[PDB]
């Protein structure tokens, strides 16, 4: 699809068998999801932005379906105010900014 930017670019994702809403964020290096269970080992990370840093759990090799398009990569889990799809998965679904 072509997504215009008059409104927040929200899509449905499927992760860990769960449907969620998430923001496509070209300004995010990483993908960050609210508290949920994921399989595998994890390691802590601190990630920052406006307002400072939060602590998250880093899980690797996680599959996500993003608006119907599957991608695999690292997913960070923690107290994010918004579920965010970042560049690590946006690249995999072939997303570009065009103007």
Question: Which residues have a catalytic role annotated?
Answer: 25
- Continuous segment of H or E residues that includes residue 70: strand 69-77
Q: Binds 90, which of ligand 2NC, its own copies, none (CB < 5 to 8 A, cut-off by type)? A: its own copies
Place of tokens 């999801």: 33
Q: Binds 54, which of ligand 2NC, its own copies, none (CB < 5 to 8 A, cut-off by type)? A: its own copies
Q: Binds 30, which of ligand 2NC, its own copies, none (CB < 5 to 8 A, cut-off by type)? A: ligand 2NC
Taking the C-alpha atoms of residue 47 and residue 31, their distance in angstroms, rounded to an integer, is 11
Our CB check for its own copies shows the closer of 13 and 25 to be 25
| Binder among 17, 52, 72, 77 for its own copies (CB under 8 A) | 52
Minimum distance of its own copies from residue 39's CB (angstroms): 24
Taking the C-alpha atoms of residue 35 and residue 79, their distance in angstroms, rounded to an integer, is 6
Q: Which residues bind ligand 2NC (CB under 6 A)?
A: 23, 25, 27-30, 32, 47-50, 80-82, 84, 86
Residue 61 CB-density burial (10 A; 0-12 exposed, 13-18 middle, 19+ buried): exposed
Taking the C-alpha atoms of residue 43 and residue 26, their distance in angstroms, rounded to an integer, is 24
């Amino acid at each position: 699809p072509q997504i215009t930017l008059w409104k927040r670019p929200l899509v449905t994702i499927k992760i860990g068998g769960q449907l969620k809403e998430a923001l496509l964020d070209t300004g995010a290096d990483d993908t960050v999801i609210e508290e949920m269970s994921l399989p595998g080992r994890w390691k802590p990370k601190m990630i920052g932005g406006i307002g400072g840093f939060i602590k998250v759990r880093q899980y690797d090799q996680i599959i996500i379906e993003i608006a119907g398009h599957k991608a695999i990569g690292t997913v960070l889990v923690g107290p994010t105010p918004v579920n965010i799809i970042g560049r690590n998965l946006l690249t995999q679904i072939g997303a570009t900014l065009n103007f």
